[PDB]
């Protein structure tokens, strides 16, 4: 079973205890740690932060403690224009420059592979993504003849049916990819004017406005789309989402004035790290969507959907039962990485619960 964990670049800038560098990652936690994100500049893979070269180096030295640890670099993300990915991929010359540029850049900085994070191809892009992947792999195949062990290639895929049909030819890319991380935690559109959970595992009975909008839909659908189970990795979120409430209504359908106030360390309207969530829980009312098997919390005018040791465990049981290749965590800097907030001393409490479960019979 793989445990694929993301680390984010911009996490180093958060104040006081929120500051995370790759130094803090326990090297026996994950099987694969993925650095996010890399830029493309001059049609060529490239660093993003001013000091990525250093943080790459600090991450790749975690390999000294655990020589088996695999690392990847992720290209794209959202700060980065789909538009701009589209331009690179849809032309045979910009696509060629970029692909050729990737192996020596990985080798130089000590990575074992590439993660493609194009969020997200439009329908005109679908056929180019397929070509990118296909030719990117052939290049990793060509490079391996040089003696070093073959570079890994993975991709991050949205878990919403619409976005899947629109941008991906799953049958085709699964052939060349070493795994796919399914982004099963963006299932509650913020544009909706009500409460709701974003990584439910099951639809629930509550009403069924969408039956497609849950992890189990996403996984069965990829499998039916011809993604083999052994190349599929289910995404588990480590953060929560928050919404300010339009009333004292707090249950299914409860109306919303908008996103929740910024977390103290992440300072982003609508999102909270698990460590800022454990602190929010003090003085909160706690509930669990029985059917969707994930929790939520509320206090003052603030309502929060999130994952916990129990829901994270339960997802890991589900993916084993389904014989998926493993789990993906978003993300190491949003787990309680210091272990100081969440009562038990335990650091990376969310990621360790998964890890503990993956090891079970």
Ligand X SMILES: *[C@@H]1O[C@H](CO)[C@@H](O)[C@H](O)[C@H]1NC(C)=O
According to DSSP, the β-strands at 44-46 and 326-330 are: unpaired
Identify which of residues 88 and 316 has a Cβ nearer to ligand X in the complex: 88
Q: Which helix (H) or strand (E) holds 162?
A: helix 161-167
Q: How many CA atoms lie within 13 A of 164 on its CB side?
A: 25
Could you give the CA distance from residue 180 to residue 166 in angstroms, rounded to a whole number? Answer: 17
Q: Which residues contact 45 (CB under 8 A, 6 or more apart)?
A: 38, 39, 73, 75, 98, 101, 102, 105, 114
Identify which of residues 80 and 221 has a Cβ nearer to ligand X in the complex: 80
CB of 16 to ligand X, least distance (A): 25
Identify which of residues 10 and 212 has a Cβ nearer to ligand X in the complex: 10
CB of 96 to ligand X, least distance (A): 17
Q: Which residues contact 333 (CB under 8 A, 6 or more apart)?
A: 7, 8, 11, 20, 273
Nearest-CB residue for ligand X = 41
Could you give the CA distance from residue 123 to residue 116 in angstroms, rounded to a whole number? Answer: 17
CB of 175 to ligand X, least distance (A): 30
CB of 43 to ligand X, least distance (A): 8
Identify which of residues 53 and 229 has a Cβ nearer to ligand X in the complex: 53
Identify which of residues 43 and 71 has a Cβ nearer to ligand X in the complex: 43
Give the interface with ligand X as residue ranges (CB under 6 A): 39, 41, 48
CB of 8 to ligand X, least distance (A): 14
Identify which of residues 48 and 306 has a Cβ nearer to ligand X in the complex: 48
CB of 41 to ligand X, least distance (A): 3
CB of 94 to ligand X, least distance (A): 12
DSSP secondary structure of 300-344: TTEEEE---HHHHHHHHHHHHHTT-SEEEEE-TTTS-TTS-SSSS
Peptide bond preceding 331 in cis form (omega within 30 of 0): yes
Identify which of residues 80 and 120 has a Cβ nearer to ligand X in the complex: 80
CB of 102 to ligand X, least distance (A): 15
Could you give the CA distance from residue 103 to residue 111 in angstroms, rounded to a whole number? Answer: 9
Identify which of residues 51 and 61 has a Cβ nearer to ligand X in the complex: 51
C-alpha dihedral (308, 196, 271, 334), degrees to nearest 10: 20
- Closest C-alpha among 156, 181, 186 to residue 271: 186
């Amino acid at each position: 079973y793989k445990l694929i964990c993301y680390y984010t670049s911009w996490s180093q800038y958060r104040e006081g205890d929120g500051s995370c560098f790759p130094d803090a990652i326990d090297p026996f936690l994950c099987t694969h740690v993925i650095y996010s994100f890399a830029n493309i500049s001059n049609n060529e893979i490239d660093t993003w932060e001013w000091n990525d070269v250093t943080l790459y180096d600090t991450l790749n030295t975690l390999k000294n403690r655990n020589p088996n640890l695999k690392t990847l670099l992720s290209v794209g993300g959202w700060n980065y224009g789909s538009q701009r990915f589209s331009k690179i991929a849809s032309k045979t010359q910009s696509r060629r420059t970029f692909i050729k540029s990737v192996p020596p850049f990985l080798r130089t900085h000590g990575f074992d592979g590439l993660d493609l994070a194009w969020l997200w191809p439009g329908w005109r892009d679908k056929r180019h993504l397929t070509t990118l992947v296909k030719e990117m792999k052939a290049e990793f195949v060509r490079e391996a003849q040089a003696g070093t062990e073959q570079l890994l290639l993975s991709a991050a895929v949205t878990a919403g049916k619409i976005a899947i049909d629109r941008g991906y030819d799953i049958a085709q890319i699964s052939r060349h990819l070493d795994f796919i991380s399914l982004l099963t935690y963006d299932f509650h559109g913020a544009w909706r004017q009500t409460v709701g959970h974003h990584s439910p595992l099951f639809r629930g009975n509550e009403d069924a406005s969408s039956r497609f909008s849950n992890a189990d839909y996403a996984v069965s659908y990829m499998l039916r789309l011809g993604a083999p189970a052994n190349k599929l990795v289910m995404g588990i979120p480590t953060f929560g989402r928050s919404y300010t409430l339009a009333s004292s209504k707090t249950d299914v359908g409860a109306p919303i004035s908008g996103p929740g106030i910024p977390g103290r360390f992440t300072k982003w309207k609508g999102i909270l790290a698990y460590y800022e969530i454990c602190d929010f829980l003090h003085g909160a009312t706690t509930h669990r969507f029985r059917d969707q098997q994930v929790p939520y919390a509320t206090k003052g005018n603030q309502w929060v959907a999130y994952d916990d040791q129990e829901s994270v465990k339960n997802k890991a049981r589900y993916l084993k039962n389904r014989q998926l290749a493993g789990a993906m965590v978003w993300a190491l800097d949003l787990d309680d990485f210091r272990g100081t907030f969440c009562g038990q001393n335990l650091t990376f409490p969310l990621t360790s619960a998964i890890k503990d479960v993956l090891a079970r019979v």
